[PDB]
Design a protein around this ligand. Structure first.
Ligand SMILES: OC[C@H]1O[C@@H](S[C@@H]2O[C@H](CO)[C@@H](O)[C@H](O)[C@H]2O)[C@H](O)[C@@H](n2cc(Sc3ccccc3)nn2)[C@H]1O
Length: 138
């Protein structure tokens, strides 16, 4: 049981074949969740489930540079359900982050920030009860 918002240090940044696992439970009337993989103040990879944007559920992903959001990447495949236990796995690959939820592939996001070994924090926020956050090499 971890207090949200939660900061997970990623020592020496990320690297291909590093797997980051987030476990928790979605709150009963959730509206939003966010994962923010940060390089200093920049956000290399923002992963943002939205449960009610114009009465649709959507995943929004983006990058923040010098305090400005860039081009959003959107999709309607949406695996989360309010009130349920979830697992998000983010696997760093050479050209992209890959995300799987509850053991089903969800999306990939190409690397816009290229200094991977400087992406040294993961922020976890929004409408969840967070159980644990950790990493391993596969
Ligand atoms: O681009 C990614 C960002 O998008 C904006 S919303 C964006 O705003 C633009 C300008 O008005 C419109 O042009 C676009 O159409 C529209 O999508 C979101 O507010 C950004 N966010 C999401 C979250 S979660 C969260 C929020 C509070 C507390 C905990 C977790 N925290 N920050 C980010 O997701």
């Amino acid at each position: 049981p971890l207090i949200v918002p939660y900061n997970l240090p990623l020592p020496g940044g990320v690297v291909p074949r590093m797997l980051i696992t987030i476990l928790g439970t979605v709150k009963p009337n959730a509206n939003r969740i966010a994962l923010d993989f940060q390089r200093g103040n920049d956000v290399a990879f923002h992963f943002n489930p939205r449960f009610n944007e114009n009465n649709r559920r959507v995943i929004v992903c983006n990058t923040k540079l010098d305090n400005n959001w860039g081009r959003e990447e959107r999709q309607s495949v949406f695996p989360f359900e309010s009130g349920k236990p979830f697992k998000i796995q983010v696997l760093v690959e050479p050209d992209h982050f890959k995300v799987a939820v509850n053991d089903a592939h969800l999306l990939q996001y190409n690397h816009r920030v290229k200094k991977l070994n400087e992406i040294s924090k993961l922020g976890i926020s929004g409408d969840i009860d967070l159980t644990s956050a950790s990493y391993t090499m596969i």
